[PDB]
Amino acid sequence: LADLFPGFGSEWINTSSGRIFARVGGDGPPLLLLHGFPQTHVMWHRVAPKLAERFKVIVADLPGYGWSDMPESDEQHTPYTKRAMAKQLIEAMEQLGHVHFALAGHNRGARVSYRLALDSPGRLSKLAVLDILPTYEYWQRMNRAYALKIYHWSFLAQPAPLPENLLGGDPDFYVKAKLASWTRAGDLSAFDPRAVEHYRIAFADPMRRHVMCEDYRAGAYADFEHDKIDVEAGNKIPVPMLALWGASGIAQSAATPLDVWRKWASDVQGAPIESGHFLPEEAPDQTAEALVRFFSA
């Protein structure tokens, strides 16, 4: 497995729920980067160096993902709810002395990120979310067209062991197909092959795949309910916020992303990127420039 972060250290950070693995590089204001599914921290490898020119950059594996420890789940999928993941990453940042930091997330990590902003806004100086809408908004849009396009939201949320059993037959095919199907190109050419191997290796482990399913089960249940409380209360994120999305990604598919996020946040700017879902890899230059400019201001 390649080292894709020149000049970054490697740290295991202790928390009450298990270790968080992170690559750590740079100096200056702290910035945490959170990946999603079906990836690991390495999906930031093309934009993290540019950010580390200006920031101390912490590139973390989500709880249960990558090389982070896997806390034991329960019938309500608690440790893989975004509320719990955010609490665990808040603990990890406190181990480094960071109680007020910038945060960017993609896919599941962006769900941790906006849930963190809603629960604990004092932790965040600025927030960027990449190619997502809130979990509540995806479910409210779950008509025929969306049920077909993001079928995995219902499939991976089926009770164990149905998705685990299906994924175990040919996991390499599944992870590679999901990566490719959400790129503008439709193949793996937007990814560094060494990064794909990181994703393939993690996805090859049945315990890691079970975590992913627990994450999607939380996404169908507790995460949805948590979001629903905020919608009904009219709670908006007060943290200065950036919403990036791919012109052909998931978030734009049944909604207008900036219009949606303005319903969830009082200080949000946005921009489309010529890209599929995987902005930091398909469009590293535009993504890095947008993030550097946002987090510097």
Add this chain to the structure above:
Amino acid sequence: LADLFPGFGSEWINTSSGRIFARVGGDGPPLLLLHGFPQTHVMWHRVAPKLAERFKVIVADLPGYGWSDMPESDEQHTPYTKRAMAKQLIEAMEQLGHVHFALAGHNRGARVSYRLALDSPGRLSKLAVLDILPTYEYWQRMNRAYALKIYHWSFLAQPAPLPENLLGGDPDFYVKAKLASWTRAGDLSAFDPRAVEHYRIAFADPMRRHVMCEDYRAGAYADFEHDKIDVEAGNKIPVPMLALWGASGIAQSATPLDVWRKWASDVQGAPIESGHFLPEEAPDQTAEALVRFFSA
């Protein structure tokens, strides 16, 4: 594989789209029985003897299922659309000299049946649909709760080869879990083990599994478009119709008779205490309901 229709003959019926396998028994007015997913014609084995006391009973494998031939599909999943399947089964019935017949279907076969009634009503004396709503109504009801309860419609409709590759690793596990999941009790006790073996053997064939996925792709695309045309035009089935559903089945997740009254001008209906698989979970009540409907 067991013979679950003692006394019934066996026919391989040529059509322009491929052979239809059927068991044939009884005597009287002709009655065609159509299974669905993930089953074969044998799921009628508990009700077919009683029906054969009153009707000439034709128990057919759907195009591409069981022992029927598997036409090559295309970009629109055409041979596995219910419109195409209905045309093919009309041809098969004509080979037996049946140009006007009674029809009962379950699951995918019930979808063939109501599409047949919409496209070619003159072919049917009476129609029964078991534990289904129209495909359009399933999709229109799509929301979070629906998507989580009946996920396989969107999963199996993903572009090839995604569901085929996932199903290929351990096919026995998936078909047995699907059968059990939709019964009242949630296990396999409602099924004759010899019938389960028929379903398992069919599902073990990758070509048969691809047909099933093409069927669900049709169900997400052309079948839905065909239904949408009819409901937006206000076209109703004029054939006298029976909707039977399981109190713990798939169709009721909606008020099925009220749904069907929007699609049919002469429909009656009743629930039965059962999961989805009415002819196996509740054979006596299903057989009686069908005998009384088709004999009236």
